[PDB]
């Protein structure tokens, strides 16, 4: 693949501010015929990617003027004057001068800018209708965070637990720019009987501390 | 307008192939070459390769190790991709691209050895605001729809995108709220299975 390494990954905004995503190739774009080929798309969440801007600059149909590509060779940028809230989504650039491969840039996950907020922790354990089955589910919800980042652990008796571990995770919420997080711990029933404490253990900037839920089996 | 009309979801056990297609409508078909590109679960985009519809000449990347084979009906505007001998690495979105200007709508692929199953449905009430819970584990394929209280809890709710592990899903949901002196429900539906289940959040006793 001609390599394309896009920066930054992440790009946190406030609506209305002005956004700068950089793109650069493992070798130059000129193709043989004048023409350089290199496109950006967006992908709002949910939906196919969609055509912004091709050949370095084209605008595409419909897309508007604050959109605006530039560069050569192998070093390009992707400018948006004014940040608005349809714009959010993943960027990504690609290359179709040297085919094949067509090559894609990993994206750019263009985000509202909130405060931070720390998540709110809830752990459940097994459902009897779970267990009259032969299976124990421990589920913790870390909901409505931010930033970002954070750490999640399940701890048994203060032993870490790997295995048998499942995460989910929202985009950013659309209203409160907010992020959530589920992790599913699943055993045999007969596994879950033979601990006693389980715990639902995260680290995030709003605590220097750990964040712990925690229960005992027996109540 | 142009428009790109992909196939529906596929559902293939590991070593089976599938064999999407892209009815093209508004542009000329035979005008621009058609790319197949893929989204894997990471996100990623990945391209599998462009057939120029005039003559048919294809190119390929070489990741695919030929296993993924181009072909077009011009008498239906139709483009065609056929993947052949599947594993898990391949569970993805599929998009035709039209001159890599035009996207189609995608179809997922998702390799499988289950049968239809469907979800075991577990209410998830607090340890001895509140939040509640209800888990809906080991289902195939998707998707499910789940609701609190009929749609009438909305607003707290978080219902998170299902994840595929030893070949069936699950997926979860909280609502945070007063309880339990009003009723909590979680409705679940699995079309596929034709399940349609209610239950309710008890205080653990
Ligand atoms: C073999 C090669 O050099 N491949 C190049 C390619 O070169 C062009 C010609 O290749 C073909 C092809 O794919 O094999 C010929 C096809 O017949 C033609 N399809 C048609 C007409 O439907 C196809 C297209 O031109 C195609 C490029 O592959 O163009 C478009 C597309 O329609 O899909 C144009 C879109 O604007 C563009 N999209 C964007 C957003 O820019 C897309 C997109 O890049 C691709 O879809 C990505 O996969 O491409 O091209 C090649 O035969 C020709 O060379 C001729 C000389 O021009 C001629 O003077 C001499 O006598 O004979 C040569 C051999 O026939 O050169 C064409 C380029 O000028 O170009 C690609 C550009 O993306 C790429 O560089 C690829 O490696
Ligand atoms: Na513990």
């Known amino acids: 693949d001609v390599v394309m390494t896009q920066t930054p990954l992440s790009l946190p905004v406030s609506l209305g501010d002005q956004a700068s995503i950089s793109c650069r190739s493992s070798?130059?774009?000129?193709?043989?015929?004048?023409?350089?080929?290199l496109h950006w798309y967006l992908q709002k969440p949910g939906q196919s990617p969609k055509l912004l801007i091709h050949?370095?600059?084209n605008r595409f149909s419909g897309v508007p003027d604050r959109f605006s590509g530039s560069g050569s060779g192998t070093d390009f940028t992707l400018k948006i004057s004014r940040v608005e809230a349809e714009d959010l989504g993943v960027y990504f650039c690609?290359?179709?001068?040297?085919?094949?491969?067509?090559?894609f840039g990993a994206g750019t996950k263009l985000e509202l800018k909130r405060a931070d907020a720390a998540p709110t922790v809830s752990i459940f354990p097994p459902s009897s209708e779970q267990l009259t089955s032969g299976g124990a589910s421990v589920v913790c919800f870390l909901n409505n965070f931010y930033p970002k980042d954070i750490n999640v652990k399940w701890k048994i008796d203060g032993s870490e637990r790997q295995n048998g571990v499942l995460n989910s995770w929202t985009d950013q919420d659309s209203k409160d720019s907010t992020y959530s997080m589920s992790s599913t711990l699943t055993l045999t029933k007969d596994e879950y009987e033979r601990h006693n404490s389980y715990t639902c253990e995260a680290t995030h900037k709003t605590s220097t501390s750990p964040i712990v839920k925690s229960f005992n089996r027996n109540e | 307008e142009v428009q790109l009309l992909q196939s529906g979801p596929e559902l293939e056990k590991p070593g089976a192939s599938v064999m999407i297609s892209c009815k093209a409508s508004?542009?000329?078909?035979?005008?621009?070459?058609m790319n197949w590109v893929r989204q894997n679960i990471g996100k990623s985009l990945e391209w599998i390769g462009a057939?120029?519809?005039?003559?048919?000449?294809?190119s390929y990347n070489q990741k695919f190790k030929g296993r993924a084979t181009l072909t077009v009906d011009k008498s239906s505007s139709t483009a065609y991709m056929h993947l052949k001998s599947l594993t898990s690495e391949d569970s993805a979105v599929y998009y035709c691209?039209?001159?890599?200007?035009?996207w189609g709508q995608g179809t997922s692929v998702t390799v499988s050895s289950a049968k239809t199953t469907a979800p075991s449905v577990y209410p998830l009430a607090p340890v001895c605001s509140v939040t509640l819970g209800c888990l809906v584990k080991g289902y195939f394929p998707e998707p499910v729809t789940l609701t609190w209280n009929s749609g009438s809890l909305s607003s707290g709710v978080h219902t998170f995108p299902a994840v595929l592990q030893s070949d069936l899903y699950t997926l979860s949901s909280s609502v945070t709220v007063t309880w339990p002196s009003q009723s909590i429900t979680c409705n679940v539906a699995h079309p596929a299975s034709s399940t349609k289940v209610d239950k309710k959040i008890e205080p653990r006793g």
């Open positions: 508004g542009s000329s078909f035979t005008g621009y070459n």
């Open positions: 050949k370095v600059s």
């Open positions: 070798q130059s774009l000129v193709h043989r015929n004048g023409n350089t080929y």
């Open positions: 057939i120029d519809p005039y003559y048919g000449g294809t």
């Open positions: 690609s290359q179709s001068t040297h085919v094949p491969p067509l090559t």
């Open positions: 691209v039209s001159g890599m200007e035009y």
